[PDB]
Symmetry: D3
Subunit: 241 residues, 6 copies
């Protein structure tokens, strides 16, 4: 029944049995979305796909435009796939974590619809950033599949593009975070401001700075993606049905 | 001595206060959120500013406001701020006179010392609030026998959204007792202008994670309607 | 091997340095803070750039591209800082080995806007270990009071920190605090330029000193400290 | 219903308190700090027990409590003098803690030691009886007294007071006040299913929360200005 | 040859014969219960029940296992779960611990002794024994954490909400009253030791109600089976 | 001013120092951990005490200090070998701490225990004496040795060394170095109104701060390498 949107890398589009047979190049009041909207059918449910970064560094992706376009195209739930670094010792490379909280360390990103010309200011609650029904459907799928996961975790959302500093990971860890990426916020909040239920699925693509012995290389990360993307796809499959 | 009050309207509902008209001012830093209301109270020249003018806290022109009050003769400032109670002793109802703050804001025009200006000034800001003003407020709270706290750390955050349970947890680890969106750059801008400044904080909700439910704009408006009166009592004694 | 130095002027009042050029260069990112001075010290091509010419508005991109364009193969950056760790009082030299970014709004990367590829640099160790050792080696030789390692807080400014702010920063692990370490250190890596920092403590951080921190007190510590800092720079360049 | 008060004597100085006195008790755990003083307060039966006469780490809480349970106590009010970590909780402040953190060690801390047949791990999530907590708050409010409705009580070991750095760590752990008597008392009340609340008087700012060093004269003075306040609060709670 | 320290019921494992039930004395008082030798899939097996936490004779226990010929130890622990990812019924294989106990006989190097050894205790659990545990949890498709920090509190009482929060502030994930000095003692006797902890309740203030023995014992009743399946494999 | 040096022998190799053998004294608190030596260094009186003569947590510190004071000690320099937690305090480094945090327990920590008729709670805000600190500092400068003028000393129980996670918690509590002998030593020194300072030599990078694990051999090399440095300091402070 309910229409789902999936935000993430293409190749999530290589999900077996998904059709994606439309491409509207949308222009919103908030400017250009990242890629055109792709609308399709999967296991009998209407499905939406937005590439988060087009064919743009995380801190300049027009998330506002993305979420408006999806709300409008008829989204009623958004599953956001996120590549992260693992801070928690148990959340190593290849691990899947379904966060339940986040701490936002971003700045200078268009992060609300309640700015510029508005006639009342609203302060959305945001105590629990992820819709709980979605989180459970992700968990139920991950248990069913016997994939190694954490059912909770705190998402540190940093600014990039640069990776983090060892003492910077020290502080994120002292702050309670389990995992760290650059694209979680303001996405989750803009979803909230639109009453759009949103939940994040996170693939750990590297140990965060200082956890492994060497240094973080883009090929370590590229490999990890390639390795784990199929696992993510299996989870979306079960969730989408 | 002339006194600015920054906070909401309703502050203007103070018994005994008169207001004589409101001039619109042009500052070198843009437009202030609202016209200044110049008035008289207990034989003391007073100016009021309604900081939100309908503006989100992150886009308020604090620079324009402060320069505006300075130029209009201000000599001290009491800022009335609505906050979230992190500390367990500071529930809905509570009044707090913070003595310290931690700024988590970011994209705001936050200093008078920007652009090619031939000389840059680094202000001390060790003690963000003028103590004599702080003592004026505390005395008033004691004298009125109201439930308050004499000290506390103010966490100033970006908004317009409210904080995450985990973000609150982080704030609690930084030593804050309350959280709001309006305290900074306001407090620092005043010191850049050598304007003694103090805040009076009203706890209008528990911070995310401290109450049993989610925070509703309904409960927060109720805590204001119930709390603006006691605030008015405090301002009154102070002037 | 060509070293560049970023910091105040008077860092050039270095004895035996024949400083010859004043090159005003233009960059794809706008103007650098000052003209690049080129010179020779000890028979090594030596590059100077005064970053001063508001820390949060300094064109850090322009400065580093300039240095890179001019032929720099390493960078020593000199920073005035407030001291958080109790062992690191007024006058203390420190060679930080880590840093924590608390800044924002600054044009902090080369990978911004219209580009066909985004590069997420590793940045686990903000500072080059070799350069660190050249600095460490020199302080030891000159018998100066210093610290081998230490954590740099970089804060927005131009305002100093609040007592509570310093408490947060200490809780985070910071030994020192300053407004210019970042994004400079990061842009250096983006340019594959080895970068290292020599910090001089010019005030105890807020609430570590007695009363307030005056500009005057800071001024006298720069006056007193620049002497030491030159001697270190001399030895490194040598 | 029978309320038992633990604190110094001179709490016994309530106007219109008959000190009906009292008998030396024996316990399977030893000798209690003082003979129990049994009295009446406006219809109510009240028990008193001075926890001294003995350094805090050597007080025999096990006997004290056991004896108080055996004498028929149904509720225990504990009065405690403390250093004040939280900026808002200076000298002479009254606090009513809601949580505690235990840093004590060499103490006979449980009735479930020894070679015993069934082990019991009590839940101790909320270390103070909430009904008792309200009864103290209500009393404080009604008397217009400056106080804190909540706080975290650090129980250290003594007899020496704390180091500056130790205080920084108690603060990072989230403690508001610091004292030497609060545990294992609160816990031992619980193993006996005996409602228990503490009322705390800050007698000194904790180490390094002020310029000098902590003096035993400062504390004497704070108990002098403090004691009367504490007594009026018991009069109400008892009534 | 392996030794398992946990409750009895770990000896309700299918495939295990318990032969000798000899009660040993040691230079450090009596152990918690007699030692029980056996075989499981052709390996010599020591089992030893550790039954009040702060008064159990951990010294006497390990020395006994050492002298009986133990060449590795698996300690099974009931714990409360601080980490939000580790609820009731989770299995955790910790890699670190932080020790908040005291008043316990914690070292073989006290009293008399001609020489005093300050052992290194950087890594309290043995990596190869963790890996065998983890390998096993993977094969059985059980929900677990490969790593985690163990807080060892004093008891017998449970923790305060604020005690828990400072344990959380310290980087801890689980909490139990029996992890220390067991690990450290094992180390002083060059015995490889690892722990497998079963979360049996959310730590204080991590959930709705209070912590109760009804709740904790159900979780133990529920979990014991998974635990036995893990040990069965690890001895295989 | 008469100094007592507490440390290993090897501190006794000072050139020009002479020492009378032992004589074993009995104290009210049992017997000191070694022969206490009386000395002269160029005519000046010095006491020497080796604290080990037993593991760190069973050392009779109560007895040592009581012995030291009965024999006329006016000040105390204690020389401690510690692991370094701070990045800038590698092996070989000298540190003059200014604060400390006690993580010990079960040790005889006070003179004011037992069944006495008066109790003393000392202030202990500043565990090390500032005049002695500077004497050590001025000395280390005079010899131009690398050192730290300040730092926080974590005093742990032992005999085992610390876990990587324990080190991370000691680090979060703001400690710079960790040893197992510093307390209750300093505190006892105070109960006796004896000015006490520590000089701490870093013998190993604390658990989890370098590639390997910590070997006893590595530590023993480190001492044999830094005791020479410490002797020099002592010689200067004693002159
Ligand atoms: O290590 C990381 N840090 C921040 N963002 C990331 N996205 C993938 N890995 C990382
Ligand atoms: O909960 C809060 N968080 C931030 N700002 C606020 N202003 C009122 N309440 C809050
Ligand atoms: O206190 C400081 N904070 C930030 N920058 C500084 N530069 C010198 N001192 C300081
Ligand atoms: O400062 C304090 N510390 C410990 N115990 C106390 N009891 C009263 N004040 C204090
Ligand atoms: O909640 C707990 N705390 C301490 N030990 C435990 N053992 C099981 N649960 C717990
Ligand atoms: O690493 C250490 N930890 C505790 N005590 C010590 N004594 C020397 N090194 C150490």
């Amino acid at each position: 029944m309910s229409v789902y949107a999936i935000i993430g890398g293409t190749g999530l589009t290589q999900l077996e049995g998904l059709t994606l047979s439309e491409s509207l190049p949308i222009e919103t009041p908030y400017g250009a979305p990242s890629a055109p909207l792709q609308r399709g059918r999967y296991a009998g449910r209407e499905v939406l796909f937005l590439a988060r970064h087009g064919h743009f560094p995380p801190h300049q992706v027009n998330y506002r435009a993305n979420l408006w376009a999806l709300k409008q195209a008829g989204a009623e739930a958004v599953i956001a796939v996120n590549a992260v670094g693992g801070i928690h010792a148990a959340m190593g490379t290849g691990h899947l974590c379904v966060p339940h909280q986040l701490i936002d360390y971003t700045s200078g990103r268009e992060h609300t619809y309640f700015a510029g010309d508005i006639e009342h200011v609203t302060h959305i609650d945001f105590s629990h950033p992820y819709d709980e029904p979605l989180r459970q459907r992700l968990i139920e799928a991950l248990r069913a599949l016997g994939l190694a996961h954490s059912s909770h975790g705190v998402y540190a959302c940093t600014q990039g593009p640069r990776l983090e500093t060892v003492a910077e990971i020290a502080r994120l860890e002292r702050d309670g975070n389990d995992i760290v990426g650059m694209t979680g916020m303001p996405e989750a909040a803009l979803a909230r401001e639109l009453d759009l239920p949103y939940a994040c699925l996170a693939l750990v693509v590297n140990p965060a700075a200082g956890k492994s012995a060497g240094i973080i290389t883009m090929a370590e990360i590229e490999q990890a993606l390639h390795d784990g993307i199929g696992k993510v796809r299996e989870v979306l499959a079960r969730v989408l049905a």
